Amino acid sequence: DNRHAADYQQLRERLIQELNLTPQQLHEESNLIQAGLDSIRLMRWLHWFRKNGYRLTLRELYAAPTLAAWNQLMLSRSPE
């Protein structure tokens, strides 16, 4: 779900080619550790969130490794 969160869409739009994932392998419920998202990607993305002041910690992206989680961590801490 992306309204202001549409910023995350660009994170994700890149994320598709980042591991070279198929769209059927990369929808928001798709597991990122399952797709093989290395921790550098994981740690690269942290800066990309905090870029717009988005609010999450990488510990949460490991805990629930799905695009949806990283994404909803924006909306669930401020409705946007």
Short mmCIF file of C-alpha atoms in Angstrom, two decimals:
data_model
loop_
_atom_site.label_atom_id
_atom_site.label_comp_id
_atom_site.label_asym_id
_atom_site.label_seq_id
_atom_site.Cartn_x
_atom_site.Cartn_y
_atom_site.Cartn_z
CA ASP A 1 0.00 0.00 0.00
CA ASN A 2 1.63 3.27 -1.13
CA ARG A 3 0.31 6.84 -0.93
CA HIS A 4 3.15 9.13 0.34
CA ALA A 5 4.75 5.76 0.81
CA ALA A 6 4.95 5.80 -3.05
CA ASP A 7 8.64 6.72 -2.33
CA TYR A 8 9.00 3.04 -1.33
CA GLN A 9 7.69 2.12 -4.73
CA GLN A 10 10.95 3.42 -6.23
CA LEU A 11 12.85 1.40 -3.61
CA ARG A 12 10.93 -1.56 -4.85
CA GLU A 13 11.05 -0.71 -8.50
CA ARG A 14 14.78 -0.86 -8.11
CA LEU A 15 14.49 -3.90 -5.75
CA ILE A 16 13.07 -5.97 -8.64
CA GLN A 17 16.20 -5.58 -10.77
CA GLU A 18 18.42 -5.42 -7.67
CA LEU A 19 18.33 -9.22 -7.20
CA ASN A 20 16.88 -9.67 -10.71
CA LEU A 21 13.56 -10.90 -9.48
CA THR A 22 10.56 -11.87 -11.47
CA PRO A 23 7.29 -9.81 -10.81
CA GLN A 24 5.75 -13.12 -9.65
CA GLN A 25 8.65 -13.29 -7.23
CA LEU A 26 8.35 -9.69 -6.19
CA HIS A 27 5.01 -8.58 -4.98
CA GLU A 28 4.63 -7.04 -1.52
CA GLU A 29 3.93 -10.36 0.28
CA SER A 30 6.98 -11.99 -1.29
CA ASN A 31 9.72 -12.86 1.19
CA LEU A 32 12.93 -10.97 0.64
CA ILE A 33 15.26 -13.32 2.53
CA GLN A 34 13.49 -16.04 0.53
CA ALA A 35 14.50 -14.20 -2.64
CA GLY A 36 18.06 -13.98 -1.38
CA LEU A 37 18.27 -10.33 -0.44
CA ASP A 38 21.76 -10.06 0.96
CA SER A 39 22.48 -7.98 3.95
CA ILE A 40 24.31 -5.31 2.02
CA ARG A 41 21.06 -4.68 0.17
CA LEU A 42 19.37 -4.80 3.55
CA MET A 43 21.80 -2.23 4.92
CA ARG A 44 21.76 -0.15 1.77
CA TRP A 45 18.03 0.26 1.97
CA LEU A 46 18.13 1.57 5.55
CA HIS A 47 19.60 4.84 4.25
CA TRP A 48 16.99 4.96 1.53
CA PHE A 49 14.18 4.85 4.12
CA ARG A 50 15.67 7.40 6.45
CA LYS A 51 16.16 9.55 3.25
CA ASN A 52 12.63 11.00 3.57
CA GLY A 53 12.64 10.59 7.25
CA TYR A 54 10.87 7.22 7.01
CA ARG A 55 10.86 5.38 10.22
CA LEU A 56 12.22 1.94 10.65
CA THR A 57 15.07 -0.09 11.87
CA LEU A 58 16.73 -2.86 9.87
CA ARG A 59 16.13 -5.35 12.72
CA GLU A 60 12.47 -5.20 11.59
CA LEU A 61 13.29 -5.95 8.01
CA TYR A 62 14.99 -9.16 9.10
CA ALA A 63 12.14 -9.98 11.51
CA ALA A 64 9.55 -9.71 8.82
CA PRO A 65 11.32 -9.96 5.51
CA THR A 66 8.67 -8.96 3.07
CA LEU A 67 8.35 -5.80 1.08
CA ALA A 68 4.99 -5.23 2.75
CA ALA A 69 6.62 -5.07 6.17
CA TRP A 70 9.31 -2.55 5.17
CA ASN A 71 6.60 -0.61 3.40
CA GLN A 72 3.95 -0.72 6.12
CA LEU A 73 6.56 0.28 8.68
CA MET A 74 6.17 3.70 7.01
CA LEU A 75 2.32 3.88 7.12
CA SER A 76 2.00 2.21 10.53
CA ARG A 77 4.08 4.91 12.19
CA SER A 78 2.36 7.78 10.50
CA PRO A 79 -0.61 7.49 8.12
CA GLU A 80 0.62 8.64 4.76
#
